[model samples]
Target: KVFGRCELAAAMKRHGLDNYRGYSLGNWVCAAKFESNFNTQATNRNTDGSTDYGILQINSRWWCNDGRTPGSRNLCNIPCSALLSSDITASVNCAKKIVSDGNGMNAWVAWRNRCKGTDVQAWIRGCRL
Candidate 1:
């Protein structure tokens, strides 16, 4: 599912991202905007031999077991395929794990490069959540 900006915002909020770890709903929404454009099935293969999966673009390096990464940690204890679901429960849960997994919101390059230090509130404006 390629969710609307507000739709995605409400969904993430429901998943507890509103103020999780001092990160606001906008932060998560904006990250997903740049990360996967709100697409559940998005995937990106990195040159470093890792693949990013799902709406949050969670990586195969330390989070998901994709059966292709050289050393899959599966830290989230989830299969990479699960991230591709329109039902974003798995993806959102893994995203929360990525935060508590000790990286903060710094796990995503797109978030750092594109969404960081920007007007993130626009991502969730009028979401009414």
Candidate 2:
């Protein structure tokens, strides 16, 4: 599923992650944009051979199994395909779990390299939430 920035922001707010894990709503919105441009079906294979899955671009090596990949820790305990669903609840839950592990959004390279210290408020501009 593809989503506009405002639409994604509303969904994230509804999921109780607007300010979750000490990060602002803008932070989440910006990270999502940089991660997958709000594409639920997004997936990418990293240079290290790990696959990133779904909107959050979660890594197969540590978060979920892509079936073809081995040695996954499956910390999220959900299949990598699950993250590709239009329903983002599982993805959001897993993201929370990742943040709880202490890295916060820093776990996402896009978040670290793009969203961090940036004017993320633009990501939520015009959103009613």
Candidate 3:
């Protein structure tokens, strides 16, 4: 699913991303924009052979199990396939785990390059709560 900007904001907040671990709502919303353009099925296979899955592009190498990442930790204890669902329940949970691991939203390169060091409030503007 390709979410509208405000729609994705609402969803992310609904899934508990608002102020999650001290990161603002717009931080997560903006990161998702650069990460996958809000597409639920986005997937990128890495040069190292691991893959990033879903809107947040959670990595198979250390987060979810994809049965191929050499150092697979499956720390989220979920299948990478679950990350592609439009529901975003698993994706949000895994994202929480990402920050939970102390990686912060900076764990995503897209976030580092695109959403960081700026006023990300624009990412979620016009969205009510």
Candidate 4:
């Protein structure tokens, strides 16, 4: 289930989310790199280091919810954890739905540019799957 740059590109292509091509991939990848270093299993910790979470730094407590369970933290139904599990399309789409209400990608692009700046080379390079 390991996904590298090429794998990620293929997944994106397969799902018709190729809008992140020349400049978007790099920005997204940079964010992912900063957020989790491409590790789908990566987790974030607070200063106390008590709340262990999933990839993309999703908190376990917040992740677990109805339709999955408040106890299971099942990412399959929970969009946050699903985003971390390498299901990029579902994760991004879900992020667009609840978090962005359809503006997630737009905000993502803006954040990518503002926070990470633009790196078209890296972006195009990352999309060669």
TM-scores for every predicted model: 0.95, 0.95, 0.96, 0.53
- Winner on TM-score between 2 and 3 is 3
Query: Which candidate model has the greater TM-score, 3 or 4?
Result: 3
* Number of clashes found in candidate 1: 0
Give lDDT tens digits, candidate 3, residues 1-129.
Answer: 999899999998889898999999999988999999999999999998899999999999999999988989999999999999989899999899889887688798999999888999999878887
In terms of TM-score, how similar is model 3 to the real structure? Answer: 0.96
Residues 1-67, candidate 1, lDDT per residue (tens digit)?
8999999988988888998988989999889888989899999999878999999999998999999
After superposing candidate 2 on the true structure, give the runs of residues whose Cα lies further than 4 Å from its correct spot.
none
Name the runs in model 4 displaced over 4 angstroms: 20-23, 47-55, 59-86, 98-115, 126-129
Q: How much lDDT does each candidate structure score? A: 0.90, 0.89, 0.91, 0.46
Which residue pairs in candidate 4 have backbone atoms (N, alpha carbon, C) closer than 3 angstroms, thus clashing?
26-123
Off by over 4 Å in 3: none
Model 2 — TM-score against the truth?
A: 0.95
Clashes of each: 0, 0, 0, 1
lDDT, residue 84, candidate 2 = 94
Q: Write the per-residue lDDT of candidate 4 for residues 25-88, one digit (tens) a residue.
A: 4445454455555567665545532233332344444333323224444433563445556556
